[PDB]
Amino acid sequence: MNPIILIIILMTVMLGTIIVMISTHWLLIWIGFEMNMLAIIPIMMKKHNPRATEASTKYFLTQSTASMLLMMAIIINLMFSGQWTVMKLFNPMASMLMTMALAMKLGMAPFHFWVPEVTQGIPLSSGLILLTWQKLAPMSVLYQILPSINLDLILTLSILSITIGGWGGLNQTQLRKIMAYSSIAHMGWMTAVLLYNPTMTLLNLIIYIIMTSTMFTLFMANSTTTTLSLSHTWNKAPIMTILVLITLLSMGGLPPLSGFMPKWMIIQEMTKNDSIILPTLMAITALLNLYFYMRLTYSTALTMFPSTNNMKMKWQFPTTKRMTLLPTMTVLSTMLLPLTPILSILE
Amino acid sequence: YPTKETAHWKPPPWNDVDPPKSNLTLNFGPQHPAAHGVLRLVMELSGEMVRKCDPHIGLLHRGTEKLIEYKTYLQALPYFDRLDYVSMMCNEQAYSLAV
Amino acid sequence: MWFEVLPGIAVMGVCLFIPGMATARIHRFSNGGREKRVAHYSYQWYLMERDRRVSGVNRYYVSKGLENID
Amino acid sequence: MSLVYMNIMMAFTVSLTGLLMYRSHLMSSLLCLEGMMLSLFILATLMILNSHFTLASMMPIILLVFAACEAALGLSLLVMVSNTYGTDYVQNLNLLQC
Amino acid sequence: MFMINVLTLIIPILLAVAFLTLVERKVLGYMQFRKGPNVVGPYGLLQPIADAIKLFIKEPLRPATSSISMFILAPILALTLALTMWIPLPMPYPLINMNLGVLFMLAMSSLAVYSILWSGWASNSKYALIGALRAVAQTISYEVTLAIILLSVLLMNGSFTLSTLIITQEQVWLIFPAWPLAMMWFISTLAETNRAPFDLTEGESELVSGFNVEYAAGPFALFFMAEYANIIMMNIFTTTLFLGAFHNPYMPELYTINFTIKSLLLSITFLWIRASYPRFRYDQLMHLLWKNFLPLTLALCMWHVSLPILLSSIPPQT
Amino acid sequence: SMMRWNRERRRLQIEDFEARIALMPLLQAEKDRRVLQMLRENLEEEATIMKDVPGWKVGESVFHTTRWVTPMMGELYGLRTGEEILSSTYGFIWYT
Amino acid sequence: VAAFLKNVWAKEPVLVASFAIAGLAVILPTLSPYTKYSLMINRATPYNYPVPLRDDGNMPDVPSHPQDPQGPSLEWLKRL
Amino acid sequence: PFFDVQKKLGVDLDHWMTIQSAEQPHRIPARCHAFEKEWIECAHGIGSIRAEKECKIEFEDFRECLLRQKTMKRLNAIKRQRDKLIKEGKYTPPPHHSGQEDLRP
Amino acid sequence: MNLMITLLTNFTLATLLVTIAFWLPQLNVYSEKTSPRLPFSMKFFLVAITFLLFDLEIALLLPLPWASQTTNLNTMLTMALLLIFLLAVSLAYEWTQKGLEWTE
Amino acid sequence: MMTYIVFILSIIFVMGFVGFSSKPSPIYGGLGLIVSGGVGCGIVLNFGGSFLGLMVFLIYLGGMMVVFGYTTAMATEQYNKVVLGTFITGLLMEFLMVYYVLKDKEVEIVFKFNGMGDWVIYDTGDSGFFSEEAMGIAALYSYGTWLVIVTGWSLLIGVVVIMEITRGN
Ligand SMILES: CCCCCCCCCCCCCCCCCC(=O)OC[C@H](COP(=O)([O-])OCC[N+](C)(C)C)OC(=O)CCCCCCCCCCCCCCCCC
Ligand SMILES: CCCCCCCCCCCCCCCCCC(=O)OC[C@H](COP(=O)(O)OCCN)OC(=O)CCCCCCCCCCCCCCCCC
Ligand SMILES: CCCCCCCCCCCCCCCCCC(=O)OC[C@H](COP(=O)(O)OCCN)OC(=O)CCCCCCCCCCCCCCCCC
Ligand SMILES: CCCCCCCCCCCCCCCCCC(=O)OC[C@H](COP(=O)(O)OCCN)OC(=O)CCCCCCCCCCCCCCCCC
Ligand SMILES: CCCCCCCCCCCCCCCCCC(=O)OC[C@H](COP(=O)(O)OCCN)OC(=O)CCCCCCCCCCCCCCCCC
């Protein structure tokens, strides 16, 4: 792609997300989602192979269905309220439709069925955009409509997301599908605490964006897309195996790492509201996520899988790739737990 | 974990680029048969562009210059009016100059 | 010569003259010898239905002037 | 409420369940999606004319323009799919199972 | 009483379409140093009747069709659209005096490509389908400059009402402020109805009009008479929108004779263009639209937006 | 020519709008007495119809406010014949 | 700059006419003396009813009758 | 993440189309302008939790202005009782409800 | 109402002429005549999508004869020239990246 | 009967959606969506949305369904039990809805709906020498500045997007 056209299209993606974030009118929310989808389609089709066309087609179908259900919820809101303010919804049917539409735009279960396909079909940079930047606009709308969200619906979606994103990555060897099922499980964690304390939702969103950005930047810096290609990283750049080790042990929610911070604050804010069974099942189901993370760490850093002889030529060359903010994102995704009461800046 | 159902699956390509798994051939002639009318052209179009043009001819082959062999020179003169049938006396003049 | 095309153009011109003259005479016939009331806007329709109510015979074109008051 | 609102909502659900149940083609899916957009257009227009809310008369045009640009983007995806596989059949889009 | 008015519109439409064939063949005769028909009637007056009776008892062509329902619906839609384009025309009083008559005509002319597209679907040929897509692409291409030239003209009118466009042109013909719009309009309406030098399906520059191949067509007479209803209608519309006549509300037949004479001269100008030029190549009229007509159309659209503001000449709304 | 003529047309539009302005108080008084006539007729017929219904308050406003609400189309033309209904409710839309 | 302008007027006169007409459309309403009168005619077109004010006692600029001298006037529109 | 940029910068990006009681072109009121103005001036500043309970009456009047469900229900009741009395022969429509009375103005 | 009568009359006359054109040449019982994917162009699709997007920009441009009546003429004139400028910028980008080629 | 004209057109609208949603082919699906767009345009025109109904015919049916039929011709060959069965299922469900709401003058599918015609809910006033819907659409330029900016930018970006992704390089 033309670099000028790439920059203009990325500004259009960012602009659509900003238009969802800042606007007070529902038509501008819908316009922002349309702008976001319309501009992120060429980022997915950057390489022009049939898997990217398939992934972009499936992404188009799901986000288009979600955008039409979103405009239907907005239309029933205009029926039952005669106004357009982005706030609580004045009808439980409009609340159900908008919660379904935003769950489809996130890819929460049972509408999760596009996320590993589209994430595997597209490159690692576009997958990074899809799994980090695209989660900002629907979580902003869910932050704005939480006085009308049905509790049973959002908690059903959250636990179904956590369980399916747990059992999904247990069968996988492709890294993009693993990150996508990790995304489904972590969005379940985020929306489980939404109607209790949305500051912890924003905390989990920021920590998850930092950790996922770290893992996709490590995958781009090593050019590895499978588990077995990630295995040869100890013979090429051994510091990267240490970084994927600490980041995957972070993303499993293991203390003293800062990926323990979001789910611990979520349990801390859900037990206040006399929910004990639900964060217990959430915390026990997170062990599946940690299990396939430990599978990756065994394959990559804790053991040494056999390499090939052509690695000796790659010993003679440095990484010329722009590893943008990778030490910064690495330090923030692991060593941020002593700074845990910084979550008040999100209040 | 390979099951009974998920056993026919292959690993994806390393570059994630799949194999792709031709153009139009037109049989073509002049629209209204008044000027030419007796032309067959086997086109190989590429959308708009023309790649190969194959004029199939012989549709007005009469075997003139075999019929000339069995007639005298005066009798074979009017065969030349009908070769280029808009340049009659020029072909008459060329055959006349040959004889 | 060239004027031989003129009977066909004359027949075509009569066939184009008939719709306009016809609809002008019909709009003068169905509206009391006047133009059809053009109500493009709701105020023109309100005045027109007010005429239909004040005429008494359910026809807007029946104009009532100063003789209808005392 | 108004009786026609039931019919426009039920038309949206008909084109929903048609879009939510594929038969063979992707073009049929895009037609059901634009039927959903059509029912949104009609229902928004009937609300806005029903309430005499003047400023939102420009809303259904903006809905139409954005979702028809969306339709053009989906038709371009369909064109690329049909150029890859020869047909617009959705069962050819199955390489992302592995 | 209103049905009489509908019939006195739509039946003289069909009669004028019948005799436009005679006017075309005679004028293209005398412009080609020859005659048109003068044997069949006195001065050729029975040639459309003989030709219509000849066509209406002619056998369906050779083949079957891919879709019988669309093979029926494409002439129905062509004739229905070609008759509904006349009902808002102010001649001086329209049949259906609607507030958005210009926009109605633009929409119903945008719908006219479905007859071409469905007749391409109904034929069994895969080559007639390609030719139908070429004709559809041509027509929808020139619909763009139709819409934008039309908008730029109506910025000097004030509304989408066609009846207001007689009031607009009482002091001057509207071709005097907008002759570049008028000449691009006239060539774009010429390219809408697939009329020469833009008739690429009816002539050469064509993949399918190629001497003994397939593709069942419909009845030729109905598509032909819908085409000539479109031609007379667009010439009346161009007359109303650029060459507006004097309207006396006590003697409307003065306006009717005046715009009738102007519309006849403009349809004869169509006949005089088609007897004068070779055809464009398909990409050459694509070039003529996209790289020649449309930049000037956008430039003059900006000029006709900004011009009633800089001259303080914004027309009234009503 | 279009400058002079559209300025004269704007002056004529302002003249027509001032004629509308000058006529609107009489038409507003007629419209007020019109809708009050029709609502009083509907109220007296509600009283003479809704006697067999147990627990029916005639003239009970469905709004909690005591403010005058603009009468709806069904509130005025609900008891009248369908010819007058169509002539009031689609007459402007179906007018030519 | 004049050699290139003659070059593009020789090669592509359609595009030169396009950019010239669009340039006039952009820059010319800021230089016209009549752009003010467009605003003055559009705001002085009475689409609504001129809802009068309750005469409290001190409103000298508001008239009591249309034919009073004070108030907004359209002599500039009659004259121009 | 409602980054209220429109109030931070002081721009009016979309506040104008938000409600029916806003500034309209040519001063056109909606059909429920007064009810929406009453509900907004009730619920302003008090928060959504206090607006659900303390502005219930204005909001019910405004929803019933928008959808006219109680009004159409009452008209259904009057018209059904009218048709039932025509069915029983206990009622006949007056001449001002039959179209034979030469309407007011 | 009169429009619906006129539309039904035009549809009825069209259907009657179609019925005559299909059934009247079936009266004269003739002989029984017994004797005995498509290639894709990207340029056709690009001219169709360019039409569609320019028609959407036209859909934005259509209320300009009504927009000229506003009191906010600086903003109206600015956004009018801006929409026609974005239509021209769409045409210029369609030019320079070889979009208008071989159907120019 | 004629007072129920918007209801009759809405029933034709639902019947057309059940028609093309059964999906016999994208050709006849496009035809069904064209007929459905025409009758839904009639629904819009019978509330007073004359400009918005002509926006249906000019933009929706005028450009977009033309591009859908254009692409259906170009990316599909030239033209069942499941189709006709789901068609008659949707037709029977919609006619049972019609029968219920005409016998009770009240129904509840998801919400409650009146059984009389929708002529009851109209206003009893005028709009003077303007249309309210026309002036609200004219307000797109004076009041709707940011909306025009984001819509024109999305169309410019859409042109850029389609030229990038259909290039194949
Ligand atoms: C409506 C009533 C009738 C109106 C007039 C129409 C009747 C006359 C018709 C004649 C016969 C036409 C038959 C079909 C012809 C089709 C071909 C065709 O039209 O080609 C168009 C040709 C095509 O150009 P071309 O092909 O000749 O040029 C070559 C093109 N390049 C270089 C790109 C390869 O011209 C146009 O497109 C021009 C359209 C109209 C232009 C109007 C300009 C007005 C003046 C502006 C200002 C100029 C001064 C400078 C700036 C001043 C600033 C203050
Ligand atoms: C409540 C929250 C509100 C919002 C707060 C702010 C949220 C910030 C969210 C950040 C989301 C980042 C999205 C992805 C990056 C965007 C830019 C981009 O496209 O980068 C990829 C780019 C592609 O280049 P390419 O050449 O194609 O790479 C393949 C190799 N040839 O280049 C590359 O591939 C270069 C390789 C390294 C790229 C690293 C990018 C890291 C970006 C994220 C930093 C961490 C997040 C910010 C801090 C926390 C904020 C919450
Ligand atoms: C809005 C206006 C529309 C106007 C449209 C029409 C324009 C043209 C107007 C009429 C022009 C003149 C028509 C002349 C027709 C030909 C007459 C003729 O020559 O008939 C001869 C033929 C054989 O006669 P025969 O008896 O055998 O001769 C032997 C003599 N020793 O005898 C016969 O064939 C028998 C008699 C046939 C008569 C036919 C008459 C013409 C019919 C044309 C249809 C339209 C007529 C006008 C309708 C509208 C006005 C009423
Ligand atoms: C394959 C199927 C068959 C194909 C062939 C037949 C269909 C194609 C040809 C017919 C196309 C019909 C187009 C009808 C709508 C045109 C727009 C319109 O109605 O404009 C006129 C007018 C608006 O003008 P205005 O003056 O503002 O309003 C009156 C106020 N004084 O508004 C009015 O006067 C409104 C009048 C009442 C509303 C009538 C609406 C039409 C009826 C419903 C749709 C019927 C056609 C459906 C299919 C169309 C094609 C897709
Ligand atoms: C700022 C004013 C408003 C500007 C925006 C509004 C414009 C309205 C008109 C819409 C135009 C849309 C299309 C524009 C495309 C421009 C790019 C282009 O066409 O470049 C190619 C062209 C050479 O053509 P070629 O590639 O050979 O094509 C074969 C055809 N024979 O290259 C050329 O021919 C060069 C074209 C550029 C030079 C034209 C200069 C005209 C100058 C007139 C006087 C000054 C006008 C005031 C404005 C300043 C202009 C710099």
UniProtKB/Swiss-Prot annotation, chain A:
EC number in record: 7.1.1.2
Record membrane topology: Multi-pass membrane protein
Gene Ontology CC terms, in alphabetical order: mitochondrial inner membrane; respiratory chain complex I
Catalytic activity: a ubiquinone + NADH + 5 H(+)(in) = a ubiquinol + NAD(+) + 4 H(+)(out)
Ranges annotated as spanning the membrane: 3-23, 25-45, 67-87, 96-116, 122-142, 145-165, 178-198, 200-220, 237-257, 274-294, 325-345
Keywords associated with the record: Electron transport, Membrane, Mitochondrion, Mitochondrion inner membrane, NAD, Respiratory chain, Translocase, Transmembrane, Transmembrane helix, Transport, Ubiquinone
Alphabetical list of Pfam families matching this protein: NADH_dehy_S2_C (PF06444), Proton_antipo_M (PF00361)
GO MF annotations in UniProt: NADH dehydrogenase (ubiquinone) activity
Highest taxon, organism lineage: Eukaryota
Compartment(s) where it occurs, according to its Swiss-Prot or TrEMBL record: Mitochondrion inner membrane
Quaternary structure and partners: Core subunit of respiratory chain NADH dehydrogenase (Complex I) which is composed of 45 different subunits. Interacts with TMEM242.
Function summary: Core subunit of the mitochondrial membrane respiratory chain NADH dehydrogenase (Complex I) which catalyzes electron transfer from NADH through the respiratory chain, using ubiquinone as an electron acceptor. Essential for the catalytic activity and assembly of complex I.
UniProt similarity note: Belongs to the complex I subunit 2 family.
Protein name: NADH-ubiquinone oxidoreductase chain 2
Naturally occurring in which organism (per UniProt): Ovis aries
Taxonomic classification: Eukaryota, Metazoa, Chordata, Craniata, Vertebrata
Swiss-Prot record, chain E:
Keyword Magnesium among UniProt keywords: no
E.C. designation(s): 7.1.1.2
Pfam families, per the entry: NADHdh
Entry similarity comment: Belongs to the complex I subunit 1 family.
Molecular function GO terms recorded: NADH dehydrogenase (ubiquinone) activity
Main location per the UniProt record: mitochondrion
Alphabetic keyword roster: Electron transport, Membrane, Mitochondrion, Mitochondrion inner membrane, NAD, Respiratory chain, Translocase, Transmembrane, Transmembrane helix, Transport, Ubiquinone
Recorded topology in the membrane: Multi-pass membrane protein
Reaction(s) this enzyme catalyzes, per UniProt: a ubiquinone + NADH + 5 H(+)(in) = a ubiquinol + NAD(+) + 4 H(+)(out)
Gene Ontology terms: cellular component: mitochondrial inner membrane; respiratory chain complex I
Residues passing through the membrane, by range: 2-22, 68-88, 100-120, 147-167, 172-192, 217-237, 253-273, 294-314
Function: Core subunit of the mitochondrial membrane respiratory chain NADH dehydrogenase (Complex I) that is believed to belong to the minimal assembly required for catalysis. Complex I functions in the transfer of electrons from NADH to the respiratory chain. The immediate electron acceptor for the enzyme is believed to be ubiquinone.
GO-annotated biological processes: mitochondrial electron transport, NADH to ubiquinone; mitochondrial respiratory chain complex I assembly
Cell location: Mitochondrion inner membrane
Top-level division of the source organism's lineage: Eukaryota
Leading EC class: translocase
Protein name: NADH-ubiquinone oxidoreductase chain 1
Swiss-Prot record, chain I:
EC number in record: 7.1.1.2
Reactions it catalyzes: a ubiquinone + NADH + 5 H(+)(in) = a ubiquinol + NAD(+) + 4 H(+)(out)
TM annotation in the entry: 3-23, 44-64, 73-93
GO molecular function: NADH dehydrogenase (ubiquinone) activity
InterPro entries in the record: NADH_UbQ/plastoQ_OxRdtase_su3, NDAH_ubi_oxred_su3_sf
Annotated Gene Ontology cellular component terms: mitochondrial inner membrane; respiratory chain complex I
Keywords annotated in UniProt: Electron transport, Membrane, Mitochondrion, Mitochondrion inner membrane, NAD, Respiratory chain, Translocase, Transmembrane, Transmembrane helix, Transport, Ubiquinone
Gene3D superfamilies per the UniProt record, alphabetical: NADH:ubiquinone/plastoquinone oxidoreductase, chain 3
GO BP: mitochondrial electron transport, NADH to ubiquinone
Function: Core subunit of the mitochondrial membrane respiratory chain NADH dehydrogenase (Complex I) which catalyzes electron transfer from NADH through the respiratory chain, using ubiquinone as an electron acceptor. Essential for the catalytic activity of complex I.
Similarity section: Belongs to the complex I subunit 3 family.
PANTHER family: NADH-UBIQUINONE OXIDOREDUCTASE CHAIN 3
Protein name from the UniProt record: NADH-ubiquinone oxidoreductase chain 3
Organism: Ovis aries (Sheep)
Gene this protein is translated from: MT-ND3
Swiss-Prot record, chain J:
GO biological process, one term: mitochondrial respiratory chain complex I assembly
Listed GO CC annotations: mitochondrial inner membrane; respiratory chain complex I
Reactions this protein catalyses: a ubiquinone + NADH + 5 H(+)(in) = a ubiquinol + NAD(+) + 4 H(+)(out)
Location(s), subcellular: Mitochondrion inner membrane
Keyword terms of this UniProt record: Electron transport, Membrane, Mitochondrion, Mitochondrion inner membrane, NAD, Respiratory chain, Translocase, Transmembrane, Transmembrane helix, Transport, Ubiquinone
An example Gene Ontology molecular-function term: NADH dehydrogenase (ubiquinone) activity
Membrane topology according to the record: Multi-pass membrane protein
Residue stretches spanning the membrane: 1-21, 25-45, 47-67, 82-102, 143-163
The organism's place on the tree of life at top rank: Eukaryota
Biological function: Core subunit of the mitochondrial membrane respiratory chain NADH dehydrogenase (Complex I) which catalyzes electron transfer from NADH through the respiratory chain, using ubiquinone as an electron acceptor. Essential for the catalytic activity and assembly of complex I.
Subunit structure: Core subunit of respiratory chain NADH dehydrogenase (Complex I) which is composed of 45 different subunits.
Family according to the record: Belongs to the complex I subunit 6 family.
Stated name of the protein: NADH-ubiquinone oxidoreductase chain 6
Organism classification: Eukaryota, Metazoa, Chordata, Craniata, Vertebrata
Encoding gene per record: MT-ND6
